[PDB]
A = this chain, B = another copy of it.
Amino acid sequence: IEQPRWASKDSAAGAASTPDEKIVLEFVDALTSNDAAKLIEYFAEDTMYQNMPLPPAYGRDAVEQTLAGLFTVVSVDAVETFHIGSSNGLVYTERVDVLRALPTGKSYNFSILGVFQLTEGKITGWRDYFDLREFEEAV
């Protein structure tokens, strides 16, 4: 919601300055679409997606199924990206995702640090790190 005190303007989302950073930034903003068919276009054939340390999805089919399933029980109401940066082929997003459980109407604020690996502008790897204590309940 509001800017954390440790937020550094040097690495703000609006300061994204490589084509990979801009692609990832556009991707995480697209999560509010709740549309697995839209989102899967960002992924390479050889790809991976994981909420650490839950079982990963490898391959674009498995990733698409995971996202599709997520969006049947949960709405991504908001994504606020505080930092974005990149280094050695990896892109990092420090952000908050707001998830709303569809059956209960309850919403959850997850503080996430995600790492992305892109190959020719397509997502080859995506791993989100965050507290899963409420993620289970949010199913």
Contacts and interface: CB of A to CB of B under 8 A. Distances in A.
Interface of A: 5-6, 8, 10-11, 15, 48, 52-53, 56, 83, 85-90, 92, 94, 109, 111-115, 117, 125, 127, 129-133, 136
Contacts of A132: 131-133
Contacts of A94: 115, 127
Contacts of A127: 6, 94, 113
Copies of this chain present in the complex amount to 2
B111 A113 contact: no
A117 B8 contact: yes
A92 B111 contact: no
Contacts of A87: 11, 85-87, 92
A76 B115 CA distance: 24
A88 B8 contact: yes
Contacts of A133: 131-133, 136
A89 B12 CA distance: 11
A78 to B, nearest CB: 16
Nearest to A11: B88
A90 B11 contact: yes
A6 B8 CA distance: 28
The 8 closest A-B pairs by CB, nearest first: A85-B87, A11-B88, A113-B129, A129-B129, A52-B111, A53-B111, A131-B132, A10-B88
